Design a protein around this ligand. Sequence first.
Ligand code: NA
Ligand code: NA
Ligand code: NA
Ligand code: NA
Ligand code: NA
Ligand code: NA
Ligand code: NA
Ligand code: NA
Ligand code: NA
Ligand code: NA
Ligand code: NA
Ligand code: NA
Ligand code: NA
Ligand code: NA
Ligand code: NA
Ligand code: NA
Ligand code: NA
Ligand code: NA
Ligand code: NA
Ligand code: NA
Ligand code: NA
Ligand code: NA
Length: 441
Amino acid sequence: KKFPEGFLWGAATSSYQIEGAWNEDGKGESIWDRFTRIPGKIKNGDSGDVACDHYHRYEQDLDLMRQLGLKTYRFSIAWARIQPDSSRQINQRGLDFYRRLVEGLHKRDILPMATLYHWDLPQWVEDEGGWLSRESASRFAEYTHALVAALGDQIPLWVTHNEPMVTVWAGYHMGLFAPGLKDPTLGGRVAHHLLLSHGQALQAFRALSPAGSQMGITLNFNTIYPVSAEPADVEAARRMHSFQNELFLEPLIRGQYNQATLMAYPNLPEFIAPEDMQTISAPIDFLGVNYYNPMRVKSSPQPPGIEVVQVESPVTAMGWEIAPEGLYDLLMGITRTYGKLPIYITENGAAFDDQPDQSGQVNDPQRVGYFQGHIGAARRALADGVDLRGYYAWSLLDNFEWAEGYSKRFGIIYVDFETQQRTLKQSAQWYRDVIANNGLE
Ligand code: NA
Ligand code: NA
Ligand code: NA
Ligand code: NA
Ligand code: NA
Ligand code: NA
Ligand code: NA
Ligand code: NA
Ligand code: NA
Ligand code: NA
Ligand code: NA
Ligand code: NA
Ligand code: NA
Ligand code: NA
Ligand code: NA
Ligand code: NA
Ligand code: NA
Ligand code: NA
Ligand code: NA
Ligand code: NA
Ligand code: NA
Ligand code: NA
């Protein structure tokens, strides 16, 4: 039950969630800086203004990574640090930060994986239409070109987008995340431009062809199970799977949108230029998979004919069902449907109500249990033919959990946000052992 020699064990973060220094060194405002200033949008009125203060404390966090024996570390790049404003001019201080981070990773034999876009769009791009505008795909490609030119040979794994489905749903359907639009009819248009931006970014990457470097995209999924064996429930589950799990995968791999997508978005074809599917479906080097929980579905008489059924137990602090078999099923399904392409699990983890004990230790056995089940499921998938290349725990650090603010702790390392003190949780200690053993037990 050892994983393959060279298997990439990592942990993941994102820029807005950990960096702080929101207005330092010429950094421009992002849509998340703006969103968190809006009263009522975030629990406890929290923001990423300071977060984990990682922009200043990155060397401490690098040593924590080393202490755990991480083989790889997934971070995102704050686009607004790099292009603060509409002049499109490169901010050298912002770029230098990522240069220093990447140098530090290599110094400690940790392989960098960089996410170009983890939701912190520069406000200047939003002022030019954001993801509603086709031109934002070109802006994203110019940003990618700059970063890959600067750091390509030093970052062996690049991800264009993180969870474009969440950007669509939370950002444009529900208004729960930045930029806070609440118009379901916009989802197709946004999805197409996210996909187009990925494609143009990938073209920029191929043009530069950095030595030893690869590029992919990270998607989130919720494995779908029908609540019963009834045909109507099976049908609802199939439709929900197509939409929830294959909206992006289908165009990425097959160069077409699926029927569930076109029905949900019936004006989508109006945004597709003659090239656009070819560009979107150009080969990626790997797929990033983010998974936390399944969704359970039943048929309904009322539109859209699908109801998601909530689960009371077993759940995390987010109310998300704990079902490690969901991860196995997801990985097998992707592999069977789209072929045996390289996969990294770019996020998997859990939020629990962690509290230091009287001695100052943070013991999180529920999180250990979550990782035990899920890493076990990933191992079974690998045994059964999935080309799993790495696993990244979400998250290295407790951090700013978007609209939940600091009420939710996903870290394997506990952060006291009053003092910025970091403490390895029991789960970090356990994970260090897994890495050293190259597997469970
Ligand atoms: Na920040
Ligand atoms: Na507030
Ligand atoms: Na409130
Ligand atoms: Na704040
Ligand atoms: Na180490
Ligand atoms: Na170095
Ligand atoms: Na070095
Ligand atoms: Na502007
Ligand atoms: Na447009
Ligand atoms: Na634009
Ligand atoms: Na530009
Ligand atoms: Na190219
Ligand atoms: Na080229
Ligand atoms: Na039926
Ligand atoms: Na959804
Ligand atoms: Na092509
Ligand atoms: Na969770
Ligand atoms: Na979870
Ligand atoms: Na708990
Ligand atoms: Na949230
Ligand atoms: Na909070
Ligand atoms: Na805080």
